[PDB]
Each structure stands twice: as C-alpha cells, then as structure tokens.
Amino acid sequence: SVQQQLEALEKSSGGRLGVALINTADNSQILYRADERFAMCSTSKVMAAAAVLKQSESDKHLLNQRVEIKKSDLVNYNPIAEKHVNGTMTLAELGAAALQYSDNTAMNKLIAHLGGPDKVTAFARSLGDETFRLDRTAPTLNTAIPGDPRDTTTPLAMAQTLKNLTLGKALAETQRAQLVTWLKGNTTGSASIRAGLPKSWVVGDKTGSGDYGTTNDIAVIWPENHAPLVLVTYFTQPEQKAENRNDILAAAAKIVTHGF
C-alpha cells in the first residue's frame, strides 16, 4: 500500500521522512510522520513573502516600495540581490527573488520590513496555523539540529497553510494569484517533487535545504483532469554534514500521486 511504500522508502533512506498530501477533490489526506516537527529551512520563505502580500492588500504602494541593497546585506547565498548592490529592489522584486531563486538577502529584507521573525509567526497564527514558528533570519534558520524547535513546523500544518494561502481563504484574490505565479516560476525545484510527477502537470513549489542533510519541498499541483493537490515532503538525517537528498522527495511524490 502507499503507507507500506513510504515506510520502505524511509527505511533504506538513512533519515526521517515526513509527508502530507491533501487531495482537494474530497479533502482526503495521505500522511506519514505528518504531525512530527522538521526544520523548514528555506520553505519558510513562503510565509514571509505571504505576510508582505497580506500587508499590500491595505497599502497599494507597498509592493513598489524601494529597498536599498548594500554589500553588507549579502550573505551566504544571494544570486539576485548581488546583482543590485548600490541600487534598489522593490518589495515585489524581493518576494520574487526570495521565492524563485531562494535568495537569502531577499528573505532577510522581507523579515526586516515586517519587523522581525516573530512577525512572520504572528502572520502564520492569523491564518490558524498554530504550529509554524520562525525564530531566526537567513542563513542561520537552516541549522536544522535534531530536536531543536527553532524554525520548524509539521508536514500537515504546512500543507494546510499552503492550501489556505494558494487555493483558499488566506489572501485577497490579486495577492493569492501573485503567490501562485511566484511558486509556479520557481527555478530551484527541478529535481525534487517536480521530478516525481507527470511532466505536463502544472506545479508551483518552494524548496529548502540545510544542515543534517535536511531536504524539503512544498508544492501545489494542478493535474490535467482533477482537482489540485497540495504536497509537503520533508526529510532530515542524523549526522550534521549528511548530503542533501532531493531524490527522496521525488520518490515520495511519485508514490503518493501514483495512478491519480
């Protein structure tokens, strides 16, 4: 069965697998360790970008607001912001950069605009997400130490919230469409969930990778002849310098979207 397949996948993997799939046709779920906490790593960037989108609903000038980028703002991984040092980027452009290129500088600018990590947590709570917590900025939010509660959530909680964000009640229509547009245009997720799906299915996703071989992806999936699917695949390992394992995410995705 699907459960037996996920079990067999995890047992050979050398780590701990978390899966939550929501089928919006009938709200049915496929769950594996879905109530267990995992370090989000860069999948947390979705929540920060969405918090700014929510603000923009009541401030029509916000998304085009200029943000100065400086050399000092650059951190371990910032492919887009490094192009704009000495100039500016709009908050919209920073959302796009954070979500589609996993730009760490962009993420931090979004957090600083909002007033710090705790403000991203409060936003998640306003959406009925009682699990999500953001504690640190980038890149330290990727330390993914086993048993550390900082910057974690559960697969189910994140799947529920991603559904609410992309297909449900969380955002205004224009902003919801913008989030969906951003996720669909992600460039960093080829080898993760996307690689376990039929090639012509439309997909939006956000990856995240960190220490302890922590390898994550969260996605919204639109089949050709069926209602959407929301999928969270989280994976983490016992040793600090373990290699990341996108291949496990692709394999989980294939297992739980089988036949369907």
* Binding-site sequence positions for substrate: 206-208
Beta strands 202-209 and 152-153, pairing class: unpaired
What angle, 0 to 180 degrees and rounded to 10, lies between the N-to-C axes of helices 173-184 and 155-167? 120
DSSP calls for 70-109 = -GGG--S--TTGGGGTTSEEEHHHHHHHHHHH--HHHHHH
Least Cα distance to 94 among 41, 33, 155, 49 occurs for 49
Of the residues 1, 13, 42, 200, only one is catalytic, namely 42
The one-letter amino acid code at 21 reads L
Residue 68 contacts residue 74 (beta carbons within 8 Å): no
Q: How far, CA to CA in Å, does 110 sit from each of 61, 78, 105, 189, 226?
A: 16, 14, 9, 22, 35
The one-letter amino acid code at 39 reads A
What is d(CA 173, CA 194) in angstroms, rounded to the nearest whole number? 26
Q: Residues annotated as binding site? A: 206-208
Residue 70 contacts residue 237 (beta carbons within 8 Å): no
Instruction: Decide if 58 is catalytic.
Output: no
Element (H, E) at 38: strand 38-39
Residue positions annotated with a catalytic role? 42
